[PDB]
Amino acid sequence: AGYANAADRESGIPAAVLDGIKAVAKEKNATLMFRLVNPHSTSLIAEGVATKGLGVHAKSSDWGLQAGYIPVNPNLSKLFGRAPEVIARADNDVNSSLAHGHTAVDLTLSKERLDYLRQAGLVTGMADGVVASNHAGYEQFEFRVKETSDGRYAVQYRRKGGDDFEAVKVIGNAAGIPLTADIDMFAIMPHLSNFRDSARSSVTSGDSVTDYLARTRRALDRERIDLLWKIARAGARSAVGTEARRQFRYDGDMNIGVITDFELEVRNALNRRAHAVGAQDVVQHGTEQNNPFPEADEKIFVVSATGESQMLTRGQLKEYIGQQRGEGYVFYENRAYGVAGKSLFDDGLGA
Amino acid sequence: TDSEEEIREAFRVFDKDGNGYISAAELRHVMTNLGEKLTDEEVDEMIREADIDGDGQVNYEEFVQMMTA
Ligand SMILES: [Ca+2]
Ligand SMILES: [Ca+2]
Description:
It is classed as layse, toxin. Keywords: CyaA, CaM, adenylyl Cyclase, layse, toxin. The assembly is dimeric. The structure holds two protein chains of two kinds. By secondary structure, chain A is of the alpha+beta class. Chain A folds into three domains: 1-37 and 182-191 and 240-341, Alpha-Beta Plaits (2-Layer Sandwich); 38-181, Adenylylcyclase toxin fold (Alpha-Beta Complex); 192-239, DNA polymerase, domain 1 (Orthogonal Bundle). Chain A contains ten helices and 14 strands. In chain A, strand 6 (153-159) and strand 7 form a beta hairpin. In chain A, helix 2 crosses helix 9. By secondary structure, chain B is mainly alpha-helical. Chain B has a single domain, classed as EF-hand (Recoverin, domain 1, Orthogonal Bundle). In chain B, 59% of the residues lie in helices and 6% in strands. Chain B has helices at residues 4-14, 24-33, 40-50, 60-68; strands spanning 21-22, 58-59. In chain B, strands 1-2 form a two-stranded antiparallel ribbon. Chains A and B meet through helix 6, helix 8 and helix 10 of A and helix 1, helix 2, helix 3 and helix 4 of B. The structure holds calcium ion (2 copies). One calcium ion is lined by residues 51, 53, 55, 57-59, 62 of chain B.
């Protein structure tokens, strides 16, 4: 279908990736919630540009031809007219990332992003390559582009009145692909029945309770009531990932953060769909519910297990969770919401 | 040995509505999503077995015992 409404188009998720999103949500029967994707990345993710992980703490850029990528030169980044300390703490960050498998690559644009840049006014014009702009950065920096035989355009730059142009450098894959912001998941609310099997293998040997007592007993049930509480416990416990959330998971050598078995099963199903269209991985880490520095991003994109999609204010967000909790979808919140007074639950919340 | 916060996230799975009590209807919806069709008598029996103080539902402190077993 592509995009079916305003929320879809406001999410900033590229049309073909959202289709898989909708599909994974129904296939796995779970509400999937996301933080808005900056619109300047939408196009890069759509044509296969790479997505960053928790490793990269380098600041991205929101202006000039480098908009959307993560500049090695911290001044070409959004932290532009910032100062010594900032620009400086900024250096380690960039440097921090290249220590671990990240390479620094020459920035080159597709003819398409080129179109997009000038269409969005991030680039107010160009000689046939001496591009212009009204961002504060152009009074301190000079830019120009160079076609190549590939179809792309090399981006070069220099400092006002200083002398020679050098390509702009941007962080990327170990595999050399440059990186752009990743799709952040706000939270994942699976339907309790996704944990049947899971409870069964923890307690039965993967069998129904009736089949297990038949298989190990012999012709008030106290033993039976016991087993049932045991599957209820086990089920709640995987649904909410109690154990999994005690450690860090990894994907190859990249740290994915704290994530439940289900949350990542979801990550892989999405990254799959993503590959089926032309993109790279787009969900590089767990949910905001286990982020230790929680964002107060204030509009969350929601995609129901039914496939319907919508935008919610933090207020309509509690109503939603509660509605959905009533239908059997499970939710757990960021452990730091309570002590801060921003809990999404209206209950005891105590002992 | 689960922590108080771990035990409270699990409590919320059962306690679907607002209140802090797991009622019979809530426990039944839980048990069949975890694949066990139960009769009302069987639900009652699970509640009963957990319901220390006798009101007809499971409160946070009773859920903790049913969890430490
Ligand atoms: Ca209740
Ligand atoms: Ca009670």
